[PDB]
Symmetry: D2
Subunit: 333 residues, 4 copies
Amino acid sequence: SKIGINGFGRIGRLVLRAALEMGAQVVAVNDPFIALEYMVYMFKYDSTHGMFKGEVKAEDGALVVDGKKITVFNEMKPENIPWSKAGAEYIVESTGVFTTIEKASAHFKGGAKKVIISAPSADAPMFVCGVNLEKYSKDMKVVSNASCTTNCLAPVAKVLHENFEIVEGLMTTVHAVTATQKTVDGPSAKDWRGGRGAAQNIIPSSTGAAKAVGKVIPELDGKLTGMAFRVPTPNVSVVDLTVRLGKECSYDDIKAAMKAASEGPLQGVLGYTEDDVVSCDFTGDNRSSIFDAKAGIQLSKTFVKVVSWYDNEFGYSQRVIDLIKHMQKVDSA
Amino acid sequence: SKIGINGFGRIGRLVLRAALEMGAQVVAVNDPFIALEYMVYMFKYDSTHGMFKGEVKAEDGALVVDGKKITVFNEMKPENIPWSKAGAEYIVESTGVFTTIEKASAHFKGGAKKVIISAPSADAPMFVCGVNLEKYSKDMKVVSNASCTTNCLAPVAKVLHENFEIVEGLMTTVHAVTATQKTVDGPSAKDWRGGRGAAQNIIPSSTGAAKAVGKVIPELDGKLTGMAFRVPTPNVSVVDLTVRLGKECSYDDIKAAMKAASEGPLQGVLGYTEDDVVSCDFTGDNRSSIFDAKAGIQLSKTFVKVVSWYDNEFGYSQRVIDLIKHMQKVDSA
Amino acid sequence: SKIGINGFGRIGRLVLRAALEMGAQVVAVNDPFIALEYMVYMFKYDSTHGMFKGEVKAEDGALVVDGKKITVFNEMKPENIPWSKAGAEYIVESTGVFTTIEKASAHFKGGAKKVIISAPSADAPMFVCGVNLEKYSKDMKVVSNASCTTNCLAPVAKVLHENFEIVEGLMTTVHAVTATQKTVDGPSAKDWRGGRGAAQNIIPSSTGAAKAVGKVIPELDGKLTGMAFRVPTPNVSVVDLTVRLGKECSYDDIKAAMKAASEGPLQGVLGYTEDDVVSCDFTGDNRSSIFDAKAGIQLSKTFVKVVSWYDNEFGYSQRVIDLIKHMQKVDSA
Amino acid sequence: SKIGINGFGRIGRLVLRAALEMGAQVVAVNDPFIALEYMVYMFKYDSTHGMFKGEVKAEDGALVVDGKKITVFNEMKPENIPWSKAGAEYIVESTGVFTTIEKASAHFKGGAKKVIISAPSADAPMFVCGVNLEKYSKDMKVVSNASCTTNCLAPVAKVLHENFEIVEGLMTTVHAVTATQKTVDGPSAKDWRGGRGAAQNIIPSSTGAAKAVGKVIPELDGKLTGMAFRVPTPNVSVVDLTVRLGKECSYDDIKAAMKAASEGPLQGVLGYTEDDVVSCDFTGDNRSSIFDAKAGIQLSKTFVKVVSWYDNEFGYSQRVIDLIKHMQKVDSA
Ligand SMILES: NC(=O)c1ccc[n+]([C@@H]2O[C@H](COP(=O)([O-])OP(=O)(O)OC[C@H]3O[C@@H](n4cnc5c(N)ncnc54)[C@H](O)[C@@H]3O)[C@@H](O)[C@H]2O)c1
Ligand SMILES: NC(=O)c1ccc[n+]([C@@H]2O[C@H](COP(=O)([O-])OP(=O)(O)OC[C@H]3O[C@@H](n4cnc5c(N)ncnc54)[C@H](O)[C@@H]3O)[C@@H](O)[C@H]2O)c1
Ligand SMILES: NC(=O)c1ccc[n+]([C@@H]2O[C@H](COP(=O)([O-])OP(=O)(O)OC[C@H]3O[C@@H](n4cnc5c(N)ncnc54)[C@H](O)[C@@H]3O)[C@@H](O)[C@H]2O)c1
Ligand SMILES: NC(=O)c1ccc[n+]([C@@H]2O[C@H](COP(=O)([O-])OP(=O)(O)OC[C@H]3O[C@@H](n4cnc5c(N)ncnc54)[C@H](O)[C@@H]3O)[C@@H](O)[C@H]2O)c1
């Protein structure tokens, strides 16, 4: 397994949690802003996901989580991380700042084998587990796991497209706050709305998902786009997809198609519920997309609104580990 | 004017604030749960809209707001409210619990002339200022001012339909919390999602707008429906309308048409902005619907997503005074 | 064990969770506002404490949780609950509405043996596990488990008093929202501040703890009082106790005394931490009181501020089960 | 007046709003992170205090607010700000990062006459209006207006000390979130509790007030200290002061003394209320400290808890204009 993590943030830390849950091996973490003793504290306590049940301590300049020793670096520059000292070969690139092939390829200076960007990439091939993993090939050295919204949207869009044909769709994500937002009104020069106080406001915003699903399901390129409203919750978001369909159908056919896929090819990626759920019901949910049967509405035989929940931190971090596992099987690693 | 208010809640008090701003005359308030000394405090201090600038005191069993004496009653059953005795003939029925014609008609027993339900009604004719006021018949004794969402959606839907034709549409409102929600998970037997802790959750809910807009614009009956997500903000909501249009157009045509209507026939009802606004920017906004030019997205020549803001408490309260003014002209009063 | 629960609210439901965790047996639940199918949903999903991991279903008009069948009643009046049909003998009185001996004794009409009020009582003897359980005697038929703040304060006050003498103290609880609070400004006639919108405000409020610790530790009667600020969090609260002490001491002596008690006589009731904890770190914490070593300040040898955390829902519900277990040992039941 | 603002943040902008209300003259603003077109948006729209009523536009490289041209600069290093060229001689240093005399003195390089740090200083003399302004020496080139908490605490502590003598006291401020807090758990290396998600948590923190009040009232040096809990509100905080008094008194004496000071020497600095107020009632409040008569508690003749509110953004911003006005009189300017 031999995973390294660059950026021990919300996703960096929860990928480490997901790796331990899945028996994957992380050997090295890099973050210039989080010293080793502070890394112990940040991994141990999580306001959203609860205290890590397990021993976490610093020992001999390494982070030790349940007996596994994780080498810690504190390099500002990715090209200076000595990944090969720790034996890290598959690097999770989770800073937010090194998303292109050019930028992510800095990790090959330290001896990394493969880099997985935990965000959309302008040029690295993008993957959503359950949707297009079979297009991965072992010569791809830098890949992307797309965004949390793309991972919720792409499963549901795949089911709708295979069964009924998406002629065109528009989506909204009602989206929890992230680390890029601000506690009170402050400077966000490249996104003025995103600078307004996160706890006070519904904030219109862009979404990664819009473009990205057109690269993940190329048949849908240019037939889907959408936007986000950031709202004052700390985690868990919901896709609200309005689609026009090519084939006439009832809402029962939509539900039966989603149910059948969640039991078979999309098992573990797409969930299905008919309960009266609210967003707190998905905190810590492992799935990429949970179809909410009761919340959706069909106006006519070809125009419908479908609602699907995702823990944007936790479900995504579990898919990073799923993607790395797939890549190492194909690579033989 | 000779307005009485039944139910001195969020809408009841802000209707009095709006009447004061618009020089309307409120002569009587009734609320069994809010004794006179408490009405002073409740009217003076408001967490969302700020302290009432001006004098509120109790004298002689009356609420005296800026010189005006308002007779206070504390009746549980509307039958027993002496409206006659205070001279209240136009009754704002803002309790939430007497919405049908037969239930609202109880105010006639104490000599009310007309009742205005401040919510959708199963059978009282619904009006939205700027959209269908000319349907108001002088012989209508119980009318409805529809919901906060219908008052936002109907202006924008009017413009789109007149210019481009709405073939079908689906709406979401991302809606602030209201008084029927719960601070922590508790019993809401008729709406199980709506009982979950309001501050913790994105909560799927129904919208009044779903029924009402096909009544207010009858040619759109059956062509439009939608749902709500309640999110943890205290006030100000946003309509997200995804429409399939009859006529090919660009997004510039949609903008130009909304700008022209806000300057002309829909002036004061529909507003227009191109600023990078967020929900807090509309707290205290007088308009029913404020079109957000920059947040909308056109996918194709006939498929588009339009975003409009509304202060669900305040814009609505001002519309209730507008409705009464219009009714009084038609009745001659 | 043979526990019945009256009021299946935040405390009613979490006492059921605590009973299952501790292997205690609940046989009957009464709530007139929550029908059986709705009880399934409310027990299964918890916005604060996460989904119940376990099977919950309605079967043959009973609630079935992990194989245990729990008879459900829906009586408005406590004297009409046929507790003996279900074999319920120890009743948790968790409505909030039947707190005196007179009111709580209604349950003896249905065949209850003992009633435990999950709130301060004006006359029923009040108990805090770890502090005064040894004053319980088997002839006491109605008892109280005091409030969540009293359960946090009393352990810490006991340690300080035994070691250093409390001459006098004043406390504040910075306290999460409860079900008595309101989503937006509405009527709370007996507590005007408590009616103001809970998510918008710091709200000064009274506390149960103030008086109650004087009944639980009678040596401290009249030497302690205090108040609450309700703040916009959904659970977890913190006591901030300013004490003048009879014996001169350093902060190290305070910490060593708290540490020694958390390892011995107060084990499981009083916790001890020296980490940089925040309130989310205590969600689901079992203890009544967790001393925060780093947050406290000693101004002089006899004047100090001590800070102690408590999950006001969860820690309290576990103490209800602890108190019932103690009572059945003393009663032989 | 000839005021320049360095750092157009929460305090920098509200200081300009306060200068406009008080007819002070701001001539220049500097912020490297906020370009002129963005300064218009940031000044016009405010989530906490509402939209600026009046004209804000950019013309010719200047910010024009109600007719006034303000020269805008975008310098990173204060040394390089041409204050001379705009005529700015009294500089509000509101960046948060140039708080020491030597760091603040950089503004003299571009011809500033005086600097006012809008935060406590390790060595610049601190002033609180109404408490120690007469200590201001004309030869003081760098002064401090202390923190929002010192400006609340010092007026109330002055009154108590003058009338009853403070023997020792311990304070807590329940403090709104600020810009140094984080929207979700993230790195705050110097304050680990302060990095945890602001909207989710009660967070123990330090207070500026702890140091500063013994400097502002030197006879209370060593007799007073305290701490903060940061809670999820956007603005408005509350001091909770527990004091041991030298002279026996009743709570009526404390009330009478606070009322007399707010009418006389501390008028406009200290306010007094007996209403059932909550934090939202003070948003936009001009005063430094508003004594809450009803929330305080006296335990004995010498031991009492006093509660005072403050709008930490707005009251403070107005005090900065007061301080500059006073300094200009003493300097003759
Ligand atoms: N938050 C979510 O729900 C979520 C989900 C999926 C994807 N993402 C994506 O993952 C990335 C990180 O997001 P996040 O939410 O974890 O943010 P975050 O701010 O919590 O984490 C970023 C981390 O990277 C560290 N860092 C910054 N510069 C570094 C550098 N030069 N070298 C190494 N480490 C550095 C920071 O200290 C921080 O700990 C982004 O691209 C984001 O869009 C976020
Ligand atoms: N809150 C909004 O944004 C909004 C906007 C538009 C319309 N409305 C509608 O207005 C109505 C009231 O809503 P609200 O937000 O003001 O709720 P609310 O709870 O604030 O007010 C309801 C008021 O009615 C009073 N009341 C209850 N029974 C009474 C009775 N028998 N007689 C007289 N008064 C009584 C209550 O004491 C309370 O003060 C609802 O139908 C709601 O759908 C609400
Ligand atoms: N919330 C906490 O942190 C906490 C902690 C300790 C103690 N308490 C106390 O426990 C009691 C309940 O508090 P809560 O937070 O669970 O409130 P809650 O509102 O969540 O629960 C009250 C429950 O009692 C039910 N009920 C009302 N009348 C009834 C009746 N006539 N018969 C039977 N059931 C009825 C309601 O439907 C509701 O489900 C109060 O006395 C409260 O002060 C609360
Ligand atoms: N927020 C409050 O309630 C409050 C009240 C009183 C005092 N203060 C103090 O005022 C100071 C600023 O606080 P704030 O709340 O306004 O924070 P903030 O983050 O809103 O504002 C800081 C501003 O300084 C700017 N800045 C950063 N570096 C700069 C530089 N090198 N030159 C010029 N400008 C630069 C930033 O762009 C930002 O706009 C702090 O010292 C704070 O403690 C805050």
